[PDB]
Design a protein around this ligand. Structure first.
Ligand SMILES: Nc1nc2c(ncn2[C@@H]2O[C@H](COP(=O)(O)OP(=O)(O)O)[C@@H](O)[C@H]2O)c(=O)[nH]1
Ligand SMILES: O=P(O)(O)O[C@@H]1[C@H](O)[C@H](O)[C@@H](OP(=O)(O)O)[C@H](OP(=O)(O)O)[C@H]1O
Ligand code: ALF
Ligand SMILES: [Ca+2]
Ligand SMILES: [Mg+2]
Lengths: 317, 747
């Protein structure tokens, strides 16, 4: 008598599913030895190179000059890198990226990251280059939590908690990827939808005109009304709340969702408006929904938030 | 990093070489050369006659000891440790059995080693064997310009010989380019331009099928295809719809330009960002527009999983050359097997004789020949890791019973193979229960012996035979190093009885399989049967290239011909488990659907005849269909265009296991060429499929145009739901319009 419950992680692109699966791996699963950490040192380097290439291209598109001219050269050096071929991280590329990150010109471009595509945790790495550039850098566990690796396929992870075994199914959150989702819609005990609170002022990678949060919203509203989940529980993680905390100061919610008329520059007011868009006034779903504000990079926040959700699920079984 | 094929200066500069013959005992001081592209080796010998060798036919290059010596005294005098250190030998042919040897003496010192080492590199190069359709046309061109008469010119009888599929229609093609069309004449390399070889091919072989594809894209104004039309075609038809837009992003506009700059005959379109029909026709046979990605052909499988998780390329009675009861036993096969990416070869060892005391390999005292062990062990030590740095499993069927001959056998192994021979277990992997079988990575360049254990038993460790009782008993003892060999019909009995117990066995232990004894002409069973249940060492007869063996060496090409393909996810995971006869799709396993419409073919035969094409699928029983066919075409083998309905493969259960087999056949049943495409990696869209011979070498001229649609499965009933997930914003917006309209009516 060892029960096995199947949990799906769903969500739009880059909402934080695979970041959650790592937290599950740290809390309950096997965790990261030094040999496991080392596996990502490559991936950290590739993220920095991908970051600055995408920022350089923006400088052209958005037509922003490089304050200092000697950084025009540096930009050319890096832009010609093949990022898939990155294994080490040495000069002149180190100082190239530093000298750039210091450039008042390209710092203007970072502030306008909203208009183009620049993955989150870009600033986490570039502010900490010297630690990463070092000739003996072992990645820290947060470095492994920040790392961005686009996910494709349908990867089932098992987890041995005391009472039960969870089989947590990770998936891709791009538009193409949802045509695969039907091949994990059997015997589902619960869904765990991830919405990225930061993406109210952002457009999708796969569609340039459409707003990420209109997608994440509509996707959730549709999916909970599907016949497969007629007897499945729906946990809604609103992730990336720390990013909101920073962004809501400058990017005003009223400008992208006109229904909002709570105060400006308020983190709390903004997040609780969103919550209502997802759950409230849905005629096709009258099941209860269990929300949760989260920060998948923040480990303590996840141990608390999930060691609750464990109960909520088992309790219904 | 997969480099493209690059000829070093020396090999175009040339080098002086003396061609010599074992049989008729001949000699010409010739200067060897390779063309810059690296298609052909060619030399000018018998009274100025240029003779060529197709490098894609080359099977091995040997120098020094391994370069065969001229055992005749008269030849040995004419030529002369130093003398053999400049001997070269080029082995080639269309399969392992029917090889051809060519010998050379380098006049200047140590250039033979430079030459041998570089011809091997060019021959094996993967980019070359999967070159673009357009490059394979440059091959045919480069042939004509090489093969010349004594006074340099290009004979016109060649140009008619090459495309001898409508000789009176060839005549008229040439005249229109301003070239010679009469059989008795020749053409100056001065004025046989590639530009002009291209224009010739256009007038000769007209493309109604491509005219179809342009208006079918959409261009009432037939002269021009604009930048976006191209980009939309490339993204919305040539792109594989099962791929992520972040990992494999779509073609940008600035990127789409570069393909116009690249493939353009007409500058009127180039300057104004358009494209001609012959620029579009150039793209279709282009380097970008291939059927498979290099990713697929590359060596980029995960090579750190345990040995029990990989399909291993395996030979049965390697020594045999055709028949099982009567015929040769060859040392040549052990090279031609291991050179072909095989990783398991069988050595049947029998006790020596009183006068001498050397063991010999042969077939169960029937009426076949013998060969000395000593040489076979050194044939294997030469070729073991010449085409793959991953381990070899020597399958000793030992019948030698004498501790004198048994100890030499263990000494021969330890001396010949040397440190490559895995003599004792590693640090990480002790021989105890619960320990997983070491990964291929962890055994790079090692010789694993498979013999019965309790001197030869000293060498045995991770591959040890045991008399199979049941899967229950094999799970009871639980040891990965123990493994079992199953005769065809014995493995077949397990398949219908306990196929699920089998996949579980193979998740930990190795299981070899070989053909039954009734197949005395060395006939091959279908290896997919046992691959389906995770069997690794599925052994086959390499002397026979029937539909089974054509498949084997076809699928094993992938992962850089290392001879190791990784079993699927669910056939490797212990926590997971499924049934190989599932007539319905599996949860956790994203199924696929497939469409295969055959459009046309180019330069398929050397004569007028009808042709037909077979499209078959090889995987799990339910995946497998193999009876689709075209109707034998009108009756001309230049540019036949089939007008047929797409062959449907709507429900592919496990798509990583499925392999498609496109194969062309002449009216009557003769083989033209085939190709093995893996269903998981194939692309969608209009694509050429450059054909191959039975031993999987690239035939140059013949090729097929086929339209593929490789999409994910959606049960018909659940289609509505699927489409709302892909684009929900449109789905919800539509419902909002309805609620919006009925707002006023309710109150
Ligand atoms: N600051 C912050 N970053 C996050 C949070 N959750 C995810 N990220 C980052 O955003 C990226 C998306 O993570 P991932 O799990 O791959 O999203 P998925 O594609 O939906 O699986 C990762 O690089 C994370 O570092 C969060 O709560 N706070
Ligand atoms: O090669 P042939 O002529 O078909 O001979 C058989 C075949 O080689 C088997 O694989 C072999 O077992 P191993 O090769 O695994 O030793 C078996 O002998 P055995 O089962 O008595 O050893 C022979 O019956
Ligand atoms: F949407 Al993902 F990795 F799950 F980019
Ligand atoms: Ca045998
Ligand atoms: Mg992910």
């Amino acid at each position: 008598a060892r029960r096995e419950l199947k949990l799906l992680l769903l969500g739009t692109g880059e909402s934080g599913k695979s970041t959650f699966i790592k937290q599950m791996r740290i809390i309950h699963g096997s965790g990261y030895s030094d040999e496991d950490k080392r596996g990502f040192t490559k991936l950290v380097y590739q993220n920095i190179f991908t970051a600055m290439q995408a920022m350089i291209r923006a400088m052209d598109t958005l037509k922003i000059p490089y304050k200092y001219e000697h950084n025009k050269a540096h930009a050319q050096l890096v832009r010609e890198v093949d990022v898939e071929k990155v294994s080490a991280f040495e000069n002149p590329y180190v100082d190239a990226i530093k000298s750039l990150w210091n450039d008042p010109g390209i710092q203007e471009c970072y502030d306008r990251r909203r208009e183009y595509q620049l993955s989150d945790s870009t600033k986490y790495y570039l502010n900490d280059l010297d630690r990463v550039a070092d000739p003996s850098y072992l990645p820290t566990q947060q470095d492994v939590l920040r790392v961005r690796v686009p996910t494709t396929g349908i990867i089932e992870y098992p987890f041995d908690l005391q009472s039960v075994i969870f089989r947590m199914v990770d998936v891709g959150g791009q538009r193409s990827e949802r045509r695969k989702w039907i091949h994990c819609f059997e015997n589902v005990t619960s869904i765990m939808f991830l919405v990225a609170l930061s993406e109210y002022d952002q457009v999708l990678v796969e569609s340039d005109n459409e707003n990420r949060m209109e997608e994440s919203k509509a996707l959730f509203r549709t999916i909970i009304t599907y016949p497969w989940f007629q007897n499945s529980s729906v946990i809604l993680f609103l992730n990336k709340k720390d990013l909101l905390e920073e962004k809501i100061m400058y990017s005003h919610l009223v400008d992208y969702f006109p229904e909002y008329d709570g105060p400006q520059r308020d983190a709390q007011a903004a997040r609780e408006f969103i919550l209502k868009m997802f759950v409230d006034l849905n005629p096709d779903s009258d099941k209860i929904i269990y929300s949760h504000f989260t920060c998948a990079t923040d480990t303590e926040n996840i141990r608390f938030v999930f060691a609750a959700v464990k109960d909520t699920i088992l309790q219904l079984n | 990093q997969l480099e493209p094929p690059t000829v070093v200066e020396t090999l175009r500069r040339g080098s002086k070489f003396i061609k010599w013959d074992e049989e008729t005992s001949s000699r010409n001081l010739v200067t060897l050369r390779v063309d810059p592209n690296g298609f052909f080796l060619y030399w000018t010998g018998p009274n100025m006659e240029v003779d060529t060798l197709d490098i894609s036919s080359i099977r091995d290059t040997r120098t020094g000891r391994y370069a065969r010596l001229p055992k005749d005294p008269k030849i040995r005098e004419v030529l002369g440790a130093r003398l053999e250190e400049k001997l070269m030998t080029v082995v080639s042919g269309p399969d392992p059995v029917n090889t051809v040897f060519l010998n050379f003496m380098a006049v200047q010192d140590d250039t033979a080693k430079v030459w041998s080492e570089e011809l091997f590199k060019l021959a094996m190069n993967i980019l070359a064997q999967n070159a673009s359709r357009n490059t394979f046309l440059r091959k045919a061109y480069t042939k004509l310009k090489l093969q010349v008469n004594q006074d340099g010119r290009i004979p016109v009888k060649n140009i008619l010989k090459m495309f001898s599929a409508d000789k009176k229609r060839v005549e008229t093609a040439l005249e229109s380019c301003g070239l010679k069309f009469n059989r008795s004449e020749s053409i100056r390399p001065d004025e046989f331009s590639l530009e002009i070889f291209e224009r010739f091919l256009n007038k000769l072989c007209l493309r109604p099928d491509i005219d179809k594809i342009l208006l079918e894209i959409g261009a009432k104004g037939k002269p021009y295809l604009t930048l976006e039309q191209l980009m939309d075609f490339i993204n919305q038809k040539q792109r594989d719809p099962r791929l992520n837009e972040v990992l494999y992003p779509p073609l940008r506009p600035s990127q789409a330009r570069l393909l116009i700059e690249k493939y353009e005959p007409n500058q009127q379109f180039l300057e104004r960002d358009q494209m001609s029909m012959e620029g579009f026709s150039r793209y279709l046979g282009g380097e970008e527009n291939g059927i498979l990605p290099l990713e697929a052909l590359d060596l980029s499988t995960d090579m750190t999983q345990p040995l029990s998780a990989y399909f291993i390329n395996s030979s049965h009675n390697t020594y045999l050359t055709a028949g099982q009861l009567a015929g040769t036993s060859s040392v040549e096969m052990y090279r031609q097997a291991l050179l072909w990416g095989c990783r398991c070869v069988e050595l049947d060892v029998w006790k020596g004789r009183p006068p001498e005391e050397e063991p010999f390999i042969t077939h169960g005292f029937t009426m076949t020949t013998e060969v000395p062990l000593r040489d076979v062990l050194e044939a294997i030590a030469e070729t073991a890791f010449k085409t793959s740095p991953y381990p070899v499993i020597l399958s000793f069927e030992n019948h030698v019973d004498s501790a004198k001959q048994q100890a030499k056998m263990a000494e021969y192994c330890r001396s010949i193979f040397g440190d490559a021979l895995l003599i004792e277990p590693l640090d990480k992997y002790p021989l105890a229960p619960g320990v997983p079988l070491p990964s291929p990575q962890d055994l790079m360049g090692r010789i694993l012996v498979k013999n019965k254990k309790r001197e030869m038993s000293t060498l045995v460790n991770y591959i040890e035979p045991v008399k199979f009782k049941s899967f229950e008993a094999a799970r009871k003892r639980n040891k990965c190093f123990e493994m079992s060999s199953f005769v065809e019909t014995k493995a077949m009995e397990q398949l219908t009885k306990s196929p699920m117990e089998f996949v579980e066995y193979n998740k930990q232990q190795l299981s070899r399989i070989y053909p039954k004894g009734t197949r005395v002409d060395s006939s091959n069973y279908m290896p997919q049967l046992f691959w389906n249940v995770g069997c690794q060492l599925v052994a086959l007869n390499f002397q026979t290239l029937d539909v089974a063996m054509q498949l084997n060496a076809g699928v094993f090409e992938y992962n850089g011909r290392s001879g190791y393909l990784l079993k699927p996810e669910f056939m490797r995971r212990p926590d997971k488990s499924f049934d190989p006869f599932t007539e319905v799709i599996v949860d956790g396993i994203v199924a696929n659907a497939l469409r295969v419409k055959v459009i046309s073919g180019q330069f398929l035969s050397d004569r007028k005849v009808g042709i037909y094409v077979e499209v078959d699928m090889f995987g799990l029983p339910v995946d497998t269909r193999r009876k689709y066919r075209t109707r034998t075409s009108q009756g001309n083998s230049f540019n036949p265009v089939w007008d047929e309905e797409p062959f449907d493969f709507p429900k592919v259960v496990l798509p990583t296991l499925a392999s498609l087999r496109i194969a062309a056949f002449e009216e009557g049943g003769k083989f033209v060429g085939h190709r093995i495409l893996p269903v998981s990696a194939i692309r969608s869209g209009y694509h050429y499929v450059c054909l191959r011979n039975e031993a999987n070498q690239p035939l140059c001229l013949p090729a097929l145009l086929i339209y593929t649609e490789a999409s994910d499965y959606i049960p018909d009933d659940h289609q509505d739901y699927a489409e709302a997930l892909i684009n929900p914003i449109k789905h919800v917006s539509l419902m909002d319009q309805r609620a919006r309209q009925l707002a006023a009516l309710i109150g």
